[PDB]
Amino acid sequence: LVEMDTDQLKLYEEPLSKLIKTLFPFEAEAYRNIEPVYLNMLLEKLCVMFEDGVLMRLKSDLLKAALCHLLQYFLKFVPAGYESALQVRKVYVRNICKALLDVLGIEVDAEYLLGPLYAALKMESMEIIEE
Amino acid sequence: WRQRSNTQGSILINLLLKQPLIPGSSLSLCHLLSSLSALREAQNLAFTGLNLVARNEGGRRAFPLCQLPGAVHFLPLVQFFIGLHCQALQDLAAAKPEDSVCILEGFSVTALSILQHLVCHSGAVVSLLLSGVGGQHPLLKMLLHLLAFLQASVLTQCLKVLVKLAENTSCDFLPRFQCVFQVLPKCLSPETPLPSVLLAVELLSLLADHDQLAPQLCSHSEGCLLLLLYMYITSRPDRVALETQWLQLEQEVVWLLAKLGVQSPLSNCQCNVEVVRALTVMLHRQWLTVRRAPRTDQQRRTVRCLRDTVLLLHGLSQKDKLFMMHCVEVLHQFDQVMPGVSMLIRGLP
């Protein structure tokens, strides 16, 4: 929808997307916020968006930032779960990291990406804690 | 492609779901599907991958093949299951109960064969095999060692999987795959089953496309791998093969010969000596057809095979200036073959 909405997505703005982000899986996270049935697939639609990493495509940077914040929230929401794969998450994270590098190449502020970078530090810190 | 490709991926998942799609197994996946905990996690990932495969879909591509990341993920999980089957083969390699472990490995191999059918169904699973350890997949290389080591049927399934992989594989990738067969040809035996040998012949046709196997030649006789395989084909004991199935193995050899004939590149060669013996074996089959003198579909297939055999015999006469020297070894057969050729001309309509 966000690519399709275009100027209408700009008319919807970051807030209609933010309201959806607030509505689902926001802050509380846990098993209840994310459907067991959605499982990887709810993450996978986000992962496909992460794979596109289209911050530039979105008409509004703030809407893109809200989507990036939602992705950062999704990473905070993400906890290892049945039907969720850390390697799949790492591949999504790698797609997110490439998107983050593109945002880094042209970002006025780290903004949501700095929150994503903190999420990037998380798990990588766990890998440092182990490996 | 698109949703229809995803449905084809789902159909491959449905075949894995079906108990068992593989022959000789009561159940496929599920209890048969299931560190051991890591393998269980991989099996859950494979189920997620199967759900992902349902959700999402030149010459090496061949017919366009749907590619699913989940199918590739399932293939990695399948590789872990294959690794458990490989570990039983590795334990057998270490050895100088275990059969039950081999039976569990065989069920895993049957699952791997179902996975290989799924790999034929899904490009991404094939692509992961194509990338390999760095080439041959590390699990696949272990499987190739296992194939060298029921078990013969699993090896035949692996050879069939290799032939499917070879069609998926780029000819340069197939050449890197090629020469695995030369070790396999040494593994292949008259004692080893003819149906397995027919799968090897299908693998040999895939090998003929591969450049390294194409570099391997009938010339150099017994030392040449192709000639030695032809010599086994020339014996044609076919003890495992029965009736049409024995004819089908001969027909597969004829198709492989036709592929060699199509190729521009294709005694001194055991295979050339074998080809006169093979022509005599074809003549014996032709004599049976002459004795039959095509209402049965198998009989109709045999008549087409006899027409193919006659074309191969015509090609063999074109191939050798000394057609007569080859003929003199097969001359008692050749007089029968000439009667058979007249019967074949009568058969042609």
Swiss-Prot record, chain A:
Domain of life: Eukaryota
Record note on modification: Phosphorylated.
Tissue: Ubiquitous, with highest expression in testis.
Subcellular location: Nucleus; Chromosome; Nucleus envelope
Subunit structure: Forms a heterodimer with ATRIP, forming the ATR-ATRIP complex. Present in a complex containing ATRIP and RPA-coated single-stranded DNA. Binds to DNA, and to UV-damaged DNA with higher affinity. Interacts with MSH2 and HDAC2. Present in a complex containing CHD4 and HDAC2. Interacts with EEF1E1, the interaction is enhanced by UV irradiation. Interacts with CLSPN and CEP164. Interacts with TELO2 and TTI1. Interacts with BCR-ABL after genotoxic stress. Interacts with UHRF2; this interaction promotes ATR activation.
Family (UniProt): Belongs to the PI3/PI4-kinase family. ATM subfamily.
Function as written in the Swiss-Prot or TrEMBL entry: Serine/threonine protein kinase which activates checkpoint signaling upon genotoxic stresses such as ionizing radiation (IR), ultraviolet light (UV), or DNA replication stalling, thereby acting as a DNA damage sensor. Recognizes the substrate consensus sequence [ST]-Q. Phosphorylates BRCA1, CHEK1, MCM2, RAD17, RBBP8, RPA2, SMC1 and p53/TP53, which collectively inhibit DNA replication and mitosis and promote DNA repair, recombination and apoptosis. Phosphorylates 'Ser-139' of histone variant H2AX at sites of DNA damage, thereby regulating DNA damage response mechanism.
Disease: Seckel syndrome 1: A rare autosomal recessive disorder characterized by proportionate dwarfism of prenatal onset associated with low birth weight, growth retardation, severe microcephaly with a bird-headed like appearance, and intellectual disability. Cutaneous telangiectasia and cancer syndrome, familial: A disease characterized by cutaneous telangiectases in infancy with patchy alopecia over areas of affected skin, thinning of the lateral eyebrows, and mild dental and nail anomalies. Affected individuals are at increased risk of developing oropharyngeal cancer, and other malignancies have been reported as well.
Name of the protein in question: Serine/threonine-protein kinase ATR
Species whose genome carries this gene: Homo sapiens (Human)
Lineage: Eukaryota, Metazoa, Chordata, Craniata, Vertebrata
Full-protein positions shown: 280 to 410 of 2644
Curated annotation (Swiss-Prot), chain B:
Membrane-spanning parts: none
Expression sites (tissue/organ): Ubiquitous.
PTM note: Phosphorylated by ATR.
Location relative to the cell: Nucleus
Subunit structure: Interacts with ATR. Heterodimer with ATR. The heterodimer binds the RPA complex and is then recruited to single-stranded DNA. Interacts with CEP164 (via N-terminus). Interacts with CINP.
Domain notes from UniProt: The EEXXXDDL motif is required for the interaction with catalytic subunit PRKDC and its recruitment to sites of DNA damage.
Family, similarity comment: Belongs to the ATRIP family.
Function noted in UniProt: Required for checkpoint signaling after DNA damage. Required for ATR expression, possibly by stabilizing the protein.
Name of this chain's protein: ATR-interacting protein
Gene source species: Homo sapiens (Human)
Organism taxonomic ancestry: Eukaryota, Metazoa, Chordata, Craniata, Vertebrata
Gene: ATRIP
